[PDB]
Design a protein around this ligand. Structure first.
Ligand SMILES: *[C@@H]1O[C@H](CO[C@@H]2O[C@@H](C)[C@@H](O)[C@@H](O)[C@@H]2O)[C@@H](O[C@@H]2O[C@H](CO)[C@@H](O)[C@H](O)[C@H]2NC(C)=O)[C@H](O)[C@H]1NC(C)=O
Ligand SMILES: Cc1noc(C)c1-c1cc(C(=O)NCc2ccc(S(C)(=O)=O)cc2)c(=O)n(-c2cccc(Cl)c2)c1C
Ligand SMILES: [Cl-]
Ligand SMILES: [Cl-]
Ligand SMILES: [Cl-]
Length: 215
């Protein structure tokens, strides 16, 4: 996240770090005790057997006993298209089930088909590049825009300065009005261009599918 701020510790208890031999590579969102959702591009070409799913994290540089760590048992796909960067969503089934507590909570999702208007105020977040990789979870106020955005995405733009998501924020939730409406998918013009909005997989278009998998 470029131009954001440190989150209060454990402010976003559904926020997940996907890791490979102890190194963050993507965000995800806890959507049931034994499932997270992230971007399909996050696990393209990746050794899924090596992926660790880290719940209840705040500062990745620290040892944090609040953390719970799982392996990925299975992935569920929904028509990811890497050429057009469409349907950029995956569900990762965990090899066990999270202990749900203050620091580890399931996210709330929108209704299937909900579409955000121009002007909706959201929070983006993640441990991605700060302009290297963040140690402390970052959050950022953004505004939904339809200009320079396809109908098949939800896009956001920070007004009046250069700020936005960046590499390693891939897969992270966009929270609007308390609900997870986006999964960070792609940037154009480099991170924080101030020109192209950031694009997210539109979670509300995939809710019936998510529901069918997670119960
Ligand atoms: C910057 O964003 C914060 C947080 O955004 C809200 O909460 C997110 C989780 C998500 O649901 C967003 O869509 C929400 O807009 C805003 O914080 C709110 O601030 C008001 C006072 O302005 C306060 O009444 C609320 O309690 C705050 N909500 C939370 C959860 O902290 C803030 O207003 C945004 N600022 C701007 C200028 O956009
Ligand atoms: C690296 C990498 N490896 O696989 C992919 C996909 C990427 C990739 C490609 C891209 C990418 O290709 N971006 C350029 C781009 C140009 C044009 C269009 S389009 C379909 O609107 O004409 C989409 C994306 C990308 O943005 N990102 C990205 C970077 C920062 C944050 C986030 Cl959430 C994503 C990533 C990670
Ligand atoms: Cl790998
Ligand atoms: Cl709607
Ligand atoms: Cl580009």
């Amino acid at each position: 996240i470029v131009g954001g701020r440190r989150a209060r510790p454990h402010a976003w208890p559904f926020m997940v770090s996907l890791q490979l031999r102890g190194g963050h590579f993507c965000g995800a969102t806890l959507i049931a005790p034994n499932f997270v959702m992230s971007a399909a591009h996050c696990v393209a070409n990746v050794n899924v057997r090596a992926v660790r799913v880290v719940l209840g994290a705040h500062n990745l540089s620290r040892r944090e006993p609040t953390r719970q760590v799982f392996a990925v048992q299975r992935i569920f796909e929904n028509g990811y298209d890497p050429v057009n960067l469409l349907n950029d969503i995956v569900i990762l089934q965990l090899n066990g089930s999270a202990t749900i507590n203050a620091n580890v909570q399931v996210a709330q999702l929108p209704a299937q088909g909900r579409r955000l208007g121009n002007g909706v105020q959201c929070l983006a977040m993640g441990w991605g590049l700060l302009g290297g990789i963040a140690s402390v979870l970052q959050e950022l106020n953004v505004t939904v825009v339809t200009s320079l955005c396809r109908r098949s995405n939800v896009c956001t733009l920070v007004r009046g300065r250069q700020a936005g998501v960046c590499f390693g924020d891939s897969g992270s939730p966009l929270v609007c009005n308390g609900l997870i409406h986006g999964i960070a998918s792609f940037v154009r013009g480099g991170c924080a261009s101030g020109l192209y909005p950031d694009a997210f997989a539109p979670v509300a278009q995939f809710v019936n599918w998510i529901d069918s998998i997670i119960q």
